[PDB]
Symmetry: C4
Amino acid sequence: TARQRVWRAFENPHTSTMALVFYYVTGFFIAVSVIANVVETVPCGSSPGHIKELPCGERYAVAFFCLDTACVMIFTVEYLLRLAAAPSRYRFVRSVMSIIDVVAILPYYIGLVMTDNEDVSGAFVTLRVFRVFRIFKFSRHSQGLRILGYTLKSCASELGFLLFSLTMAIIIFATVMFYAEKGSSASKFTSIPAAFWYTIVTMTTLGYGDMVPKTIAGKIFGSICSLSGVLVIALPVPVIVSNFSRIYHQNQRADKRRA
Amino acid sequence: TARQRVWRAFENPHTSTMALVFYYVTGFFIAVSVIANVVETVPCGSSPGHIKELPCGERYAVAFFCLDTACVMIFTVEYLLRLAAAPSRYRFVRSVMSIIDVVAILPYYIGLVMTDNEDVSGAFVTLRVFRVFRIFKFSRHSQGLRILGYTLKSCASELGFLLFSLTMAIIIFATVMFYAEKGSSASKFTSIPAAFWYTIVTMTTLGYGDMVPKTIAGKIFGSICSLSGVLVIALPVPVIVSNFSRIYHQNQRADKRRA
Amino acid sequence: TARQRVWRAFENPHTSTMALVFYYVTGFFIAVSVIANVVETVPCGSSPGHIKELPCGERYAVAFFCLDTACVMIFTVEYLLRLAAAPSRYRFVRSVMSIIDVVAILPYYIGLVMTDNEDVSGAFVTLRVFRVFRIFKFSRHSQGLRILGYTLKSCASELGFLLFSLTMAIIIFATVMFYAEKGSSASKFTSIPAAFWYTIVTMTTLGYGDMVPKTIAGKIFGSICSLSGVLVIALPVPVIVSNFSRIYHQNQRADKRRA
Amino acid sequence: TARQRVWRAFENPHTSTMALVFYYVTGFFIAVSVIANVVETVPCGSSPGHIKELPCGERYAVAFFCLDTACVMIFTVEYLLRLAAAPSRYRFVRSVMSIIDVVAILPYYIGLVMTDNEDVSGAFVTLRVFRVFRIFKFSRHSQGLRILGYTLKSCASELGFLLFSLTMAIIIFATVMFYAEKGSSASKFTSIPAAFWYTIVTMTTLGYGDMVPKTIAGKIFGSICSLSGVLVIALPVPVIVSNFSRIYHQNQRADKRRA
Ligand SMILES: [K+]
Ligand SMILES: [K+]
Ligand SMILES: [K+]
Ligand SMILES: [K+]
């Protein structure tokens, strides 16, 4: 019963005070690691003996490294204990949660085994972009009433269909806008993939304004794209609202049929 | 009886006629204070002897000071009339509108007790900002503002967690976008907090365009971010309208139970 | 019965072939006058003997004036016949339709009585801005199933309330942004009315990008304003949808209870 | 029987297996043609002897011409197989998908009959634009595209009149905004059609910001225009979702009547 006790402590933290406090402690380290990751890019001032101000992640290299290694030791101990007290270890590993945990904790170890190649370029940048995966664990720790998740998986069909229609519309409008605008002077529409950016920014009603049409045909088709973008942003709202209300009432019905 | 008579004159001023008069007088004074606050920052111009065109609040500082102190005298006397006529002084003081009144009137007296050093900087700006909360006193003049407050109080936990998830998505997108765009030339994505601005502007479908991606990876993730903004537009609507409908329907049921 | 015949020809065009053709003819002149008004501002090319290319409204002054006077004679004859065949002439005049008709036809006559002051400035510009009022007549001629109008007048209460809340939010956010951003260099937030523009452009999720925050406090409050703008644009959709469906079903119910 | 056997193989290719094979082959060829069209505009670069980096469509024009003519040979033979196996040649030819097929394949043969003069300019761009309508042939591969087409055909008159009203509002706002902003310095509101661009960009809540108001009156009317864009976002949703629900519910009723 010891292994089942540790497991029921893990996926049901509220049962035991010690389980609850371990839950809150690992949540706190996830939060501090996320905040440290965000902070270690902020350029600290006073530029001590440097041509340009160094970010807090290079000026205080050892401090942020010690904080990172404390967080990663906590995460690794968590994952090892979960792998121990898992009833079906293979099924536990196959869960997307363990995948996220391992791909979040790996960057630290992979950087530690490449300290000799400290002058590496490009690869470590992606490696430590994957250090943003700890926010996923943090979102998991707030596993409140996920009516929104149920609504999203209820609407998944129409959302994927809208994504496919949006892809077709993006390709069509990008072709049209590129051919209308390839001939302008210093034109930003240098290719159809280049016009993909303008199209996706227009159909979402961003309009950054870096790429704008400069020709009458380009402006006509940009207007058509704008209207289709109005439709794009507007359509999901009523159906998401309806599905949310439906699942909400369904959950109260389930609660009452449990009483 | 005078205490409770004045109280009833206050919270149901439609019963009496002098109470309605005082109601409309204090509403007028609130409007006057708000309009004076807005206008006194407008550059009046045409001021000889000063190269910089002073605002109407410094060229005619005497008139605006007299107007604001008259408005705050009205607010102070009406607040003391509320307090003196309350059946329960503690309950009224703890009530949110009392906090609104006190946060509206305290800045003037704080400026009075600070005026010994007219060279105050950094604090007077905060006082001026808090001088706008006199507009919140219009809730007493609008059942719509009361029902909006009740709706927001109902949408407390769920909008809180929705904002938490939005913040988590902002952190994720800011991380990926900073690391995609830190290396560009004269880049504005100088840190992850710096890219917080781009992420929040994109996820809301503003697209100021002041800072836009310039790399292929940055543009791919900006496209994903805007597409997620399409869902950001629709996410709060279900729960906001559901809570509003709940409040409205219990109001209807209560009004029918009255009949 | 002659006057009632002319009236029933006017407000019920489909009855008589001659009534229908007069309806279509006056619709066609409204369309041609609108198109002429739009065109007479387009700068025609070839710049014949001019420092700068003249618009089609000054190069062909007589042609556009003759087209305008033909349209205005048709409109005046229409309005005179309506005033004749009106059963209650005073009530007919008091209708907003006759107000729009007279304020649309007046610009021509008022310009004709001020041809001596052909060098007038400013006033005639507004006078001929009111020449855009003919589009209102044109929209009237398409008096199809106005379920949208009924829905809008059904939602008028909540729409006005949302407008009032938007006004309060604009004033509050403008005060906050101006005080956060008055101190920047070459700042566009030179007053609270100046920040009205930024606020209204942000809460509607336009983000032109001419006025953007440049300070950390300004960016924080611009983010709050952006989120409130998401709420602003998102909220009307479900309620308009519900009201539209309700009135739609009500209209089919009315049609069937008429059968 | 061969005619009808092949026909059934075409419009219900799930029945057979060789029909499913030909189905997936032609879907693959449609995807290949679309991707080739997009890619061949991308500047390949690294081309010695040419200062301008040619697109992949001119550096490797032979490969892309062979690929496109192979795709169009497949399209031509499959179209002639549809036509030859149709029970009713006229009904099939008049059917919209036949128009899609012919408008997809005609540009290639028009280019073939134009190739005697390879210096064609202005027409070849139109042919290239119409070469994207091969993407529409994916409707045969998506029940979602068919139901979207049915919905749009249902939302024919009402969206038409909604677009008419939107155009009328665009004309009104463009008139007032041009006359508010014609007098500014280096103004981009050079005509009412010039302000059509600003009006459509603002009413859709894009706000590129390329052309923004610079006058107080221009800013007031731009605020009104954006506020109207808030309604523009919500206007088509009721009728679009109502018609979609009608189509979906009659589909459900038919499928139940099957059982
Ligand atoms: K928008
Ligand atoms: K912009
Ligand atoms: K926008
Ligand atoms: K924008």
